[PDB]
Specification:
homodimer, 257 residues, alpha/beta, D-Maltodextrin-Binding Protein, domain 2, 2 domains, 4-stranded mixed beta sheet, binds the ligand N[C@@H](Cn1ccc(=O)n(CCC(=O)O)c1=O)C(=O)O, binds zinc ion, Glutamate receptor 2 (chains A, B)
Chain lengths: 257, 257
């Protein structure tokens, strides 16, 4: 039985409303729960879904050099595979193996409906509408290291804006956009932006094209015997149109706006 | 070094805005962070604050018979003491020890300012203004088992109300009160009600007296070498007026309304 590690993040993995009457894998539902079933079917294995112990995705402590979250569970042998919205990054690819991406994404802009902003360039040219990102992570790092004029201008602003424009969590960034009467725009992953856009109170909107490109991949321990099969399954699913179908179902078919 | 388990719940434990520049226990602030320092001071031990991995307080699954949250961390040896807003209950006291209560609370009513409701009696006499609680937990169970008229009347209503008046999380309940335009009242722990009342946009109000009584307590494993000292520490802090100073500090001095 393959131990799958995942994380509670809507609409990827959520508790069914009646989860208390259920048990095992049936307690969960969502995009990744559906994806796990597909992968298992094509790779030919039985599995058990478990929620990552520390509820984190995967980062290496600069001091101890220890990995936490799902990457950690894979690295230290606590799980056999990770199916969740885990970004494929150089540092993680150095310690675990990733499948080809099952979803493509990029940094995007979230605004409260009605805000007169249509792109990052628009944000960089004005001042009365503040904007920020998570206080740590790839999105913040993207701006900090950019050599592109527009993003350099945005980073210069964000790094010294007052009050601070950074937030610690997604919920924090979304709430700020929603209570700032259009005076705050949040920079986040397009997938989350797109999801929130389809959820009540339906007062946010994703604008402009993505600022960068990346994707989520299924992860397995280095030199795992599941790596090859899982990679082929992800390609087969995309070719069959199933990845797009799954995305449309959990983002739009179940939308509230 | 004593391992302390706690949970990110405002204003009990929160991440300082400059946490990325701080280390260890200094990354956190809040009522329980202050309480932990006092308890360790008077008990004479060194400690390290850790956040419970699954973000839960403590319940036993009737299936697996496994304890989750902070109670689980104590019973399975992951932490030596739990310092958080953990309600003292019979089922929990059966596996861990609780200090005398450091804070008293009870079920209360939260309304959007403007709602013509001043008590549980007012709610029980009508239906235009819907009211509910978490879909699971002590508050819901309180109503389900009550033999008291008014509470029986309230439960008789809640159990058959449509759409469902129950919510999955505190955030959901609070958000529902704020966006229901005076048509939903939320029943919750007085401590959280009093806290929300002091947070922007200052659009909610706590009405009526508590419907019941209970307390939060510090938890330690059975046979812990710290059990006795922790208990005496709580009593001394109460007698010194320290517990009330901390409540006033985190609820009102730092209040925004
Ligand atoms: N892919 C990330 C984890 N992850 C997943 C989904 C998601 O929506 N967001 C962030 C959304 C936001 O920007 O608020 C995120 O950070 C990782 O690999 O660590
Ligand atoms: N004391 C509970 C945990 N706990 C702590 C703080 C709190 O505000 N609320 C609930 C607030 C609300 O009713 O929405 C709560 O359920 C336990 O011991 O499990
Ligand atoms: Zn298939
Ligand atoms: Zn941070
Ligand atoms: Zn003292
Ligand atoms: Zn539930």
């Amino acid at each position: 039985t393959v131990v799958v590690t995942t994380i509670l993040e809507s609409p990827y993995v959520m508790m069914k409303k009646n989860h208390e009457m259920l048990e095992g894998n049936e307690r969960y539902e969502g995009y990744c729960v559906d994806l796990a079933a597909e992968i298992a079917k094509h790779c030919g294995f039985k599995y058990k879904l478990t929620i990552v112990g520390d509820g984190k995705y995967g980062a290496r402590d600069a001091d101890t050099k220890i990995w936490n979250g799902m990457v950690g569970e894979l690295v230290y042998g606590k799980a056999d595979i990770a199916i969740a919205p885990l970004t494929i990054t150089l540092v993680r690819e150095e310690v675990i193996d990733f499948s080809k991406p099952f979803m493509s994404l990029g940094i995007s802009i979230m605004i409260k409906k009605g805000t007169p902003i249509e792109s990052a360039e628009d944000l960089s040219k004005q001042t009365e509408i503040a904007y920020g990102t998570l206080d740590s992570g790839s999105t913040k790092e993207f701006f900090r290291r950019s050599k592109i004029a527009v993003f350099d201008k945005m980073w210069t602003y964000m790094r010294s804006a007052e009050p601070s424009v950074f937030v610690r969590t997604t919920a924090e960034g979304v709430a700020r956009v929603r209570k700032s009467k259009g005076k705050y725009a949040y920079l986040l992953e397009s997938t989350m932006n797109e999801y929130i856009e389809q959820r009540k109170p339906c007062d946010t909107m994703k604008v402009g094209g993505n600022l960068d490109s990346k994707g989520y991949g299924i992860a397995t321990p280095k030199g795992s015997s599941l790596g090859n099969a899982v990679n082929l399954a992800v390609l087969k699913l995309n070719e069959q149109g199933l990845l797009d179908k799954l995305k449309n179902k959990w983002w739009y078919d179940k939308g509230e706006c």
